[PDB]
Amino acid sequence: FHFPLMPRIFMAVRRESRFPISEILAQTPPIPDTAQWGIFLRNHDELTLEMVTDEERDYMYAEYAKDPRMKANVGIRRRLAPLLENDRNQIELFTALLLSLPGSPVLYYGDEIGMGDIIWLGDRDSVRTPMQWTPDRNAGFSKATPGRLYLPPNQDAVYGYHSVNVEAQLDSSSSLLNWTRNMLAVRSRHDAFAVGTFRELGGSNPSVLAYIREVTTDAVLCVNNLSRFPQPIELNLQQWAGYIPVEMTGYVEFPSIGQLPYLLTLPGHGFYWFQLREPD
Amino acid sequence: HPNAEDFGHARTLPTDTNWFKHAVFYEVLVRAFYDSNADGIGDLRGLTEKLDYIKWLGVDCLWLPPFYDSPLRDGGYDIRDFYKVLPEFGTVDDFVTLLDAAHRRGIRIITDLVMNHTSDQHEWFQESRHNPDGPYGDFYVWSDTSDRYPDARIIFVDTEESNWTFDPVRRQFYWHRFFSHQPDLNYDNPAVQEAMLDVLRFWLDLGIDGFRLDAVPYLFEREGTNCENLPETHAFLKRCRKAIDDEYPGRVLLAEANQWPADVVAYFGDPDTGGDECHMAFHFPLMPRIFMAVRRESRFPISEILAQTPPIPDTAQWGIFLRNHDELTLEMVTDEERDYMYAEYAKDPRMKANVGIRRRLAPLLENDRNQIELFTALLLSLPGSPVLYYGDEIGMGDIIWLGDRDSVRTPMQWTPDRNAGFSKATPGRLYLPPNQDAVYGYHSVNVEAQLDSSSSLLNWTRNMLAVRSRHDAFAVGTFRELGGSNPSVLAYIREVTRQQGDGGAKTDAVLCVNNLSRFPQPIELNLQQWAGYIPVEMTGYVEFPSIGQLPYLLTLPGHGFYWFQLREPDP
Amino acid sequence: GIVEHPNAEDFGHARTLPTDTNWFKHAVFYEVLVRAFYDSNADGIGDLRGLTEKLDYIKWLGVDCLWLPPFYDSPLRDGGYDIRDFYKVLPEFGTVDDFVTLLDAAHRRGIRIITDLVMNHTSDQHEWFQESRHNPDGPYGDFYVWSDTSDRYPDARIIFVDTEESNWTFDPVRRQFYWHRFFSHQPDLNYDNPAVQEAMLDVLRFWLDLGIDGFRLDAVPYLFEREGTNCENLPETHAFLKRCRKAIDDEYPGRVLLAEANQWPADVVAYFGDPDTGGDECHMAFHFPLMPRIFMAVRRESRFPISEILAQTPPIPDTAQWGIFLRNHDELTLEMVTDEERDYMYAEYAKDPRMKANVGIRRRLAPLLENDRNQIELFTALLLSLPGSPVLYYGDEIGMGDIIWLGDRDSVRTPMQWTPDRNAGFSKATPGRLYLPPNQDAVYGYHSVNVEAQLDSSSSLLNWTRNMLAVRSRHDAFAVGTFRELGGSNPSVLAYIREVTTDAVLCVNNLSRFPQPIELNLQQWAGYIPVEMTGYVEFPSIGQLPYLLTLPGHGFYWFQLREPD
Ligand SMILES: [Ca+2]
Ligand SMILES: [Ca+2]
């Protein structure tokens, strides 16, 4: 497991700068041919409840403790939704990065519907409440009386089982469950995400992280905006001159790539996934 | 009845005859906003206490629906006494206290004022029926048979069987366009015209900033016509304007006319004089078109009504809000001939569900935050002065079962405390119950909760008004639609000219790009006219690449939008 | 030409229960709205087929007869009390066939069904009235009361004096005035026309052929109109009712006719008919001012407001039976019965803060008593032990609340709260589609008040209420026994004895919120052993000296007086 990815991605969105992500990706040594990295969106190891850090090799070493958000959850497992203060746009961005970055991703149960946690149950139990299936008694987890449950379901106004459950989200295709489902459906349609090369494109704007996955049989382009404000980025895609970028979630063709820098504009914490398609 | 110099005036704001063109209106019910006397009913003094919030939100003018003494059989649009505020809201003095307190922080106040009809409990009508040969015998339209004006339609065709109702005391029929307990005033009587002009003058003397004249198309009745928009009706409105211009410069007259744009343009008055009737009228079919435009993911239903709207006088200004029905009649405006979307609406499942019911912005868009932002973004950037409805800033919902108009008149949700922080009274005493469902409930949707994170809808909405107030282009600038190759993206430019010289956020050109599709969309715009200019995104002050000769490419996410300031290149 | 209407033969007749002409005297009625109980077609509106599915619950609760408010095709401008078609069930509830399916399913488990049937007026959308206005010289021109002026019957009052300015409204098509006691869209039927009398008797016969067990004839005091009178309770009105009874007794023995007459007890006794024949009009009428008196009696902590109306109620015929329920207002007019002369509590009610708050609004039992469980039990205990056949209102068994803001009559017509699941387990439809929203407040909300929750602990109000009906059904004394008030020295304690010639039962009720002792005189049952019914516990035998019983605040006891061996 590539453990410090999430803490870096987290701090990268905090700073609205791409470089804390870029750095660990650049400083990661190459691995064997059979080998594959494992990545997930958490800050602590479930065994020791320790966040990985190296006093010498981590340049963000002192930085974390100084951040108020990071400081609050030291030693406690938290879910994705609470970690990002239930910001839907962020939840999407972090998920989008998890699925498009190199290595095999691990989803944690209940994060697909944006469940929360109960920190007071324990530093590791916090994320081990019952799966919230319906807004029925015990969140549809058990028929037993509420007292018998191994852990109580979430009952607050925000992440409560009355408002956050699978049954509720199954219907509208705009729900986080259905959104998350479809993103996995897109990822499974391009091998580039799984086992393709990874070349970071850079760009003039420090708030936008753009990179290309490639298999020798798609080339895919991912542009992620770490800033909460709308950002423009001028990318250099001369190598794919003549190619037509096609946005994957809508199968929409964008203007063909030329010699001049390609301009893309993203909203706050937005992202795009383009399939680079050959000219005819 | 009382006099004005028996209550003392409120403070007068500096005289400005264009404030209404720059203002952002906030429609707030007195009964709904805040209760300070623990009676369970929102009151003037409570609304006074919460003016600091209103100021903080950044709205310029309050619009109060009718708060006059009334039996409230028709939501207070049936006025019993024009010179008396309904007991439960307070005294006339309490209204002056509100005015003065609001003016002190530059906030203006206008009010709904029904012109066509009074309640059957109004002293006038009781004198007309009891003393037919008295001085009020001709204040209302009486008849011996209900044959007169047969071309006029029954507005509420499901409740009223006729526009003539038989009074048992006077033994005669009386005319009423609305409900049988809301008799029409006889505007052919000169005394009636003078009486209503004195009603206007009363509140104007107290120092009110303007009115919204309700039900004005139905004032005069003439044979051989549908008794709507008759010349004599307009002629009376011209007197009201003259009375404003002559006696109280810098006040406003809004016209509630629920008709197609091509018809309501007549209510601004003779265009040769630059307007001599109302200052504002409402562009009613904008929202239904914007709504259907997002449904189709096509810009054209918006483009069409904007193209088909006739030009208005120089003084005049359109009023726009994000609702599908007129609060008076609960009817959605439509013209069988001139609306090409006529048959289309009934066929849409979403539109069909809410026919005849007022709904808030959040439920109308199924609580989709991205959409709520888009519709708000269009409201603030499209031509005309916008009206926000209270509680929409925090994305409150509605309770449809309370009534077709009461649905949107629940208490303002201030905190997650008992009664949503609206009143101290026991929950049973409340005039209407607060929202309690899992989605729009006061436990999850309230001002207190949203004040903290700058990501909240309240804070987002607040800042959008802050940006809009920094560029005049939005308020009173020109409107040129840019078109584009992609049908799903509506792009346009607002522009204000360099009056005697300057290069600030005053004399701006601004660019708005809106994506009506739920999927990400690219648009290639032609901005050659601003070659060399630098687009600067307003919410972040970020400079984008300078505009060139080639088409400019912008990419938006689903239901996204951008607001660019077009800034000059450096000499 | 003429109004078509279908026939009884064209549908299946439901199963018929063994003929019994006293069932209504022993029954416990359960008033349940079809729209409110259960929705099976996910339209958001409770329907006949849904109500059929939930009959097992009704059976389990232990009620004997369902009472359904009007479910006929209607524009629903007055809660369905404005009937548009007597031979058609409102589309959203189902077809007439679906009603037969309910009947047969209910009869199979011994449950009877009665229904509200408005007699005085039809909707202005009814085919008859449309034919009367359009074809004045046709066969329906005299089906409604027409006039050239609004001058006739000036002694008659306007029932809804705040909504209607006159009892005559001008029709534009016919160019004439038409009479209506109620709203302007509910024209009065002309009962002087013999054809009208026959038409309405055929309406009765239709549903009776289908196999319905009875009716509640609504608004019957206003049928006939005569000059020089207030057009209420006229002799010809009663004369027509006598025909309805004869038609029942001759064609369908063992059916019932309830009279909704919202008047003082001394007046409604006339609706049972000539007492010489032992009754020849209605079998049941409602004793309307019982609840307001019981209510004020608990307020004062004095037994006498109850004692007084029980003493001042005139005797009724042998067939006859009183109907009693725990509500302060008549669902038709939303008026609380009172007589300025004969009610001594006349001025008293308006002065009470609690009574004053709910004037004109239907409220449930639980909110009426501020959710006080001990009171809810006391009032229920009185309802089941006092003379006459009791009517339970749906949802009161689990102590549901109301939503007053929905309307003065809709307040008590929210959906039945089955589970704490979405829509309280009433429907699968999206919450917006529901005909009325379920209760959502912290007290009476469906998260905290529902059937599923209460089924488990035998201490719940549902289970308590169920068992009280189970005890009542084990002693005939409660249903059809004599009623002798025992009095006592303590004014706060109401004690009385029901007797059949085969139990004697003793009921002691404490109206005070504090514990109270009462010394009763039960010398007549000397040697007898009182046995408390809910626990089968033997108390000390009754002697010559006064018997002392001590009750807690708002407590009560039910003793079976058992013979010595
Ligand atoms: Ca008029
Ligand atoms: Ca009648």
Swiss-Prot record, chain A:
One of its GO terms (biological process) is glycogen metabolic process. Substrate binds at residues 44-45. It comes from the Bacteria. Coiled coil: none annotated. Keywords: Calcium, Carbohydrate metabolism, Glycogen biosynthesis, Glycogen metabolism, Glycosidase, Hydrolase, Isomerase, Metal-binding, Polysaccharide degradation. One of its GO terms (molecular function) is alpha-amylase activity. Disruption phenotype: Cells lacking this gene do not accumulate increased amounts of glycogen in the presence of trehalose and show only a small effect in alpha-glucan. Combined inactivation of treS with glgB or glgC completely blocks alpha-glucan production. Belongs to the glycosyl hydrolase 13 family. TreS subfamily. Maltose-1-phosphate (M1P), the building block required for alpha-glucan production, is generated by two alternative routes: the TreS-Pep2 branch and the GlgC-GlgM branch, however it seems that the GlgC-GlgM branch provides most of M1P for the GlgE pathway in M.smegmatis. Homohexamer. Catalyzes the reversible interconversion of maltose and trehalose by transglucosylation. Maltose is the preferred substrate. To a lesser extent, also displays amylase activity, catalyzing the endohydrolysis of (1->4)-alpha-D-glucosidic linkages in glycogen and maltooligosaccharides such as maltoheptaose, to produce maltose which then can be converted to trehalose. TreS plays a key role in the utilization of trehalose for the production of glycogen and alpha-glucan via the TreS-Pep2 branch involved in the biosynthesis of maltose-1-phosphate (M1P). This is Trehalose synthase/amylase TreS. It comes from Mycolicibacterium smegmatis (strain ATCC 700084 / mc(2)155).
